[PDB]
Design a protein around this ligand. Sequence first.
Ligand SMILES: CO[C@@H](C(=O)NCC(N)=O)[C@H](O)[C@@H](O)[C@H](O)/C=C/C(C)(C)C
Ligand SMILES: [Mn+2]
Ligand SMILES: [Mn+2]
Ligand code: NA
Length: 304
Amino acid sequence: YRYTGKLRPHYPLMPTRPVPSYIQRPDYADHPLGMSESEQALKGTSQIKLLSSEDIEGMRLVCRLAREVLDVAAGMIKPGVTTEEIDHAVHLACIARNCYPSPLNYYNFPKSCCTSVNEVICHGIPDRRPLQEGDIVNVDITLYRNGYHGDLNETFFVGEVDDGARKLVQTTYECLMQAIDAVKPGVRYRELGNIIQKHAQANGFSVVRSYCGHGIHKLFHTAPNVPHYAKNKAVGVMKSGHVFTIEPMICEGGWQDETWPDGWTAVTRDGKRSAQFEHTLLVTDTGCEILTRRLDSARPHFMS
Ligand SMILES: CO[C@@H](C(=O)NCC(N)=O)[C@H](O)[C@@H](O)[C@H](O)/C=C/C(C)(C)C
Ligand SMILES: [Mn+2]
Ligand SMILES: [Mn+2]
Ligand code: NA
């Protein structure tokens, strides 16, 4: 394998962490390949669920607990902390909230969250690498409570970063927020990619095509598919009651990705940096409710 940049995996990984059996588990948790039979049963469908009141309440709770766990991870971001150490804290913070960490064994993903540094676009596997001053690192958290998943991520700076890191991260967060600002009933899912690509291209960045936002509720990934690039052909129109994520991945270089031999870590094929942000959204009559927002602070962590 020819690495595309300076990052390397740092092995061995710690043994898989158990979740106590008192925590309710999603269907894939005990499937030997991590497959989710409830997702597979819906595979080739474009139909979108209209959430009940009870469903909305379940989504509000799990998304609120997921933001609390991202904040725990945010507080740990400093030089010399390993991504494994972050994952261990996240795994304990999920169990403290009586939640299962949704990534753990999802299609055999081996950890409780994803930690993506620099050229990693997404799905990086927490490991023994200590964070370096100048890194950008994204932590992506998903929790499962009472049958509902809630998903969010932010990119953080490790100590002092360079101007290019600051622009990429800011522009990425602005792409997510301009897309959220357009959400309201009657809007097509395919329009959000136009908004995102327009702002990314104005700042000299590209938009990852291989990875997308998604419906989420009782399934971790379900309709709709939500591409982040322009002129995509995604199916569907927003309606009040729909819940989905928007999670754009924006890159310094070209948009092309490839995956490491571990089968999960997605990296820029040019080795340049990529950043991401994610929220879980509910469509409401006035626009949308950002279920994974912060409640006690105005800005994402990178701005403090
Ligand atoms: C971009 O990643 C998203 C995704 O795969 N989107 C669907 C798609 N087909 O591109 C995904 O939802 C992430 O947000 C989630 O945190 C990570 C989940 C794993 C347990 C699969 C690593
Ligand atoms: Mn996520
Ligand atoms: Mn997601
Ligand atoms: Na990255």
